[PDB]
Amino acid sequence: CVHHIKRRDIVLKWELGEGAFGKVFLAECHNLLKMLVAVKALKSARQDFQREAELLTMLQHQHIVRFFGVCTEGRPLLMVFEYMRHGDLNRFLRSHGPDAKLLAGGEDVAPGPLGLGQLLAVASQVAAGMVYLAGLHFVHRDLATRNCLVGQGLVVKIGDFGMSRIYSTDYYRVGTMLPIRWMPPESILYRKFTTESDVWSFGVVLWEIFTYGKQPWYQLSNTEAIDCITQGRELERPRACPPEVYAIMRGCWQREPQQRHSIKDVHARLQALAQAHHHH
Ligand SMILES: O=C(Nc1ccc(OC(F)(F)F)cc1)N(Cc1cccc(-c2nccs2)c1)C1CC1
Ligand SMILES: [Cl-]
């Protein structure tokens, strides 16, 4: 079922970044539809790549980054994805925040912070991707803005760099890299990962969106953040966050996993708020 792509049809442009087990390149792909694509090159490694390819071929949704296939005939092994021009959502939020004008290039279009409508549109799209994954009983385990991508026209989709571990500071070593600031108490304490720990992570993503990409618990060390989370401390309402949006975050952050609101209900509430603000 996995689509295969000839090595001749992939023209590497430049290396975007690299991690311990992979390198990501911007490339052009021929006879796929010239087309820009993001290519992951693998540094057992195989079989894990094969399971990954099968999984990415089955995950198909408007808010999941598009996977086009693999290149296995030759070395290294390649995975081909659509190119998301505006990069990862954490960097996107940080570059479209209150200090956007200071950071902007001279030619940037209408520099300034994203407005409420745009922030709800980002939030609703991430929630839609999570509704799809929950429907498949798929647990992401690392939902965070660094793992979402932004395309032209404020199109937001869920991904997973794997190599996120630029963002090494967002993970804590115990003893495996865990994104503790995005995790609920049961995941930090017992590594219990479920659709309910993903909804908790979505509440944290909502907080990152409304703080224009700040790191959750930024004032705290990893050990201090683990202690705050397990003690039940809640992140502060962001200045740009309306009370209705903070109530949605609180619904994702109920201590008992079974008490957390479903991602379908969270998505429905964000869509309703986005609809109510469209003309205002
Ligand atoms: O996000 C991924 N991979 C990935 C996707 C989906 C997925 O399914 C799940 F459900 F978990 F979401 C799992 C893993 N990337 C990053 C990625 C992809 C596409 C474009 C871009 C860029 N375009 C511009 C600057 S960077 C980057 C791969 C490492 C390549
Ligand atoms: Cl509330």
Swiss-Prot record:
<feature type="binding site">
    <location>
        <position position="40"/>
    </location>
    <ligand>
        <name>ATP</name>
    </ligand>
</feature>
<feature type="short sequence motif" description="DXXLL">
    <location>
        <begin position="34"/>
        <end position="37"/>
    </location>
</feature>
<comment type="function">
    <text>Receptor tyrosine kinase involved in the development and the maturation of the central and peripheral nervous systems through regulation of proliferation, differentiation and survival of sympathetic and nervous neurons. High affinity receptor for NGF which is its primary ligand. Can also bind and be activated by NTF3/neurotrophin-3. However, NTF3 only supports axonal extension through NTRK1 but has no effect on neuron survival. Upon dimeric NGF ligand-binding, undergoes homodimerization, autophosphorylation and activation.</text>
</comment>
<protein>
    <recommendedName>
        <fullName>High affinity nerve growth factor receptor</fullName>
    </recommendedName>
</protein>
<comment type="subunit">
    <text>Exists in a dynamic equilibrium between monomeric (low affinity) and dimeric (high affinity) structures. Homodimerization is induced by binding of a NGF dimer. Interacts with SQSTM1; bridges NTRK1 to NGFR. Forms a ternary complex with NGFR and KIDINS220; this complex is affected by the expression levels of KIDINS220 and an increase in KIDINS220 expression leads to a decreased association of NGFR and NTRK1. Interacts with SH2D1A; regulates NTRK1. Interacts (phosphorylated upon activation by NGF) with SHC1; mediates SHC1 phosphorylation and activation.</text>
</comment>
<feature type="topological domain" description="Cytoplasmic">
    <location>
        <begin position="1"/>
        <end position="276"/>
    </location>
</feature>
<feature type="modified residue" description="Phosphotyrosine; by autocatalysis">
    <location>
        <position position="172"/>
    </location>
</feature>
<comment type="similarity">
    <text>Belongs to the protein kinase superfamily. Tyr protein kinase family. Insulin receptor subfamily.</text>
</comment>
<feature type="binding site">
    <location>
        <begin position="16"/>
        <end position="24"/>
    </location>
    <ligand>
        <name>ATP</name>
    </ligand>
</feature>
<feature type="active site" description="Proton acceptor">
    <location>
        <position position="142"/>
    </location>
</feature>
<feature type="short sequence motif" description="DXXLL">
    <location>
        <begin position="99"/>
        <end position="103"/>
    </location>
</feature>
<feature type="modified residue" description="Phosphotyrosine; by autocatalysis">
    <location>
        <position position="171"/>
    </location>
</feature>
<feature type="domain" description="Protein kinase">
    <location>
        <begin position="10"/>
        <end position="270"/>
    </location>
</feature>
<feature type="modified residue" description="Phosphotyrosine; by autocatalysis">
    <location>
        <position position="167"/>
    </location>
</feature>
